[PDB]
Amino acid sequence: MLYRVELIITNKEGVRDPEGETIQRYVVSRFSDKIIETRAGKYLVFRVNSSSQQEATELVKKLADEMRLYNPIVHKIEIRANRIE
Amino acid sequence: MLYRVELIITNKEGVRDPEGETIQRYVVSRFSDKIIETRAGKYLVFRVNSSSQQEATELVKKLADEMRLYNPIVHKIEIRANRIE
């Protein structure tokens, strides 16, 4: 089975996000006062050979942990997956 | 009426993605041969006041275009929205 696994890495709610803060202040706020907040993060999407959706998702979380794609104390992650082909 | 609008910006399929290429080569490939590809992008999430889901998403689309959050000739964008509160 081939899975498309998405990994979204963002800052925890209580940790300052300089990119989102800056974009909101100098770009978004000027464009529209209907957009009240901007949070920024990293998006990584993987193609994964696996035996199940669980195996694919857990594999990516392990990657994120072991290979330090994020810092558990300041960042939070979200993993979404879907079978493809 | 509040909407959570996600904006994912990635490179078009035919345009080199240096981050994805590099992560795959030096980090992912080393971690697991079951992860065959990595594509990288930016993730931005906005909280938007709007009268409809359409108004909220088109507004973020306009933001992305007018304020140059991406280059349409080399980047692709995906917008997802969900009502909150």
User: What's the CA gap between A32 and A24, in Å, rounded?
Assistant: 10
Residue from B52, B53, B23, B26 nearest B39 by CA: B23
Of B56, B79, B52, nearest in space to A32 by CA: B56
Closest CA to B9 of B38, B55, B37, B40: B40
> Would you state the structure tokens that stand for residue B21, as one six-digit string?
């290429």
| CA B85 – CA A31 distance, rounded (Å) | 24
Q: Is B79 at the interface with chain A, CB within 8 A? A: no
Q: What share of chain A is helix, strand, coil (3-state, %, to 5)?
A: 35, 40, 25
Contact A51, B45 (CB under 8 A): no
Least CA distance to A65: which residue of chain B?
Answer: B31
Choose among B60, B55, B62: nearest CA to B45: B60
Tokens 């978004």, located at residue = A28
Burial group, residue B10, by CB count within 10 angstroms (0-12, 13-18, 19+): buried
Residue A1 touches partner B, C-beta closer than 8 Å: no
SS3 A76: strand
Note whether B49 contacts A: Cβ–Cβ < 8 A.
Answer: yes
Distance CA B32, CA A48 (A): 10
Rg (CA), chain A: 16
Tokens representing residue B68 in the block: 């140059």
Alpha-carbon distance of B8 to B28, in angstroms, equals 21
Phi/psi of residue A56, nearest 5 degrees: -65, -50
**Angle subtended at Cα B38 by Cα B29 and Cα A62, rounded to the nearest 5 degrees:** 60
| Structural domains in chain A plus CATH codes | 1-85 (3.30.1280.10)
Candidates B35, B39, B49; nearest CB to A59: B35
Name the resolution in angstroms: 1.5
* Contact residues for B78 (Cβ-Cβ < 8 A; gap 6+): B6, B7, B8, B10
State whether B38 and A45 contact (CB < 8 Å).
Answer: yes
Q: In chain A, which ranges are E strands? A: 2-11, 35-49, 75-83
Cβ pair A56, B32 in contact under 8 A: no
Q: How was this structure determined?
A: X-ray
Sign of the CA dihedral running B38, B42, B45, B51 = negative
Report d(CA B28, CA B61) in Å as an integer.
32
A31 closest CB neighbour out of B36, B39, B67:
B67
